[PDB]
């Protein structure tokens with residue numbers, strides 16, 4: 001499960017729908033084994049398309065839980081078009097690519113901060129099925 | 133009884149491409165693939181549109197097969213009838229091939245849970261196209277009615293409707 005996915009996945013429990021604490025999930029730093037996948041090519045158009053939607057505070061929270069606190073406190077902003085990118089823009093977009101797309105949790109677990117339900121990730125795949 | 137896996141693959145590829153034509157998306161969008169099975173549709177999302185996607189399926193065996201395909205999207209074990217577990221406005225669009233009729237297997241409650249939470253998970257104006265195999269007209273109307281109550285607009289496309297073999301139904305909706 002890619003780091004990007006952590007920025008959109010919320011608790012599946014219905015009672016949590018309107019809870020501010022249903023997102024982001026709380027990832028266990030002692031259980032989550034990370035993988036870097038260099039096979040997914042740099043896609044700067046996708047990143048420009050997604051950035052406005054990205055919840056930066058949630059990025060910071062999950063990344064810190066996973067042992068990365070070397071992130072800027074403010075969400076990176078960009079021009080509105082590929083051609084307007086600077087080398088500095090490009091480098092940050094590249095860092096975003098690595099962070100969001102190329103970094104994944106292969107095995108681990110995470111819980112809802114509202115209801116405490118714990119979700120498990122195995123072979124990169126989160127189990128989002130809800131028990132009786 | 134059964135269909136050759138290559139034949140199922142060819143048909144699903146064609147329906148996925150048709151769904152994408154109906155969706156008419158900008159390249160490099162963020163897409164939810166609902167009932168993704170073994171990820172064949174996700175492969176096409178990646179290749180055709182350079183899209184980034186998350187795939188949901190109830191079946192461990194399908195997802196395990198998905199793992200063997202070197203997919204670029206994220207697979208998730210989940211049940212579409214329980215709702216779409218993503219925050220508001222996450223996706224540009226959603227696509228579903230050969231899966232939603234499962235919602236009809238309480239069905240009316242699961243159908244509404246599906247459409248309400250999908251409406252929420254799409255960006256404003258986000259689109260959803262689903263190919264599905266209805267058992268009868270009432271099933272079609274029930275699904276369409278549920279989408280309507282949830283706030284979706286749009287309607288239905290039926291390709292090759294004169295053909296009992298080749299007829300296909302596509303729900304084409306906008307939030």
Ligand SMILES: [Zn+2]
Pocket residue numbers: 011012013016022112113114115116117
């Ligand atoms: Zn919860």
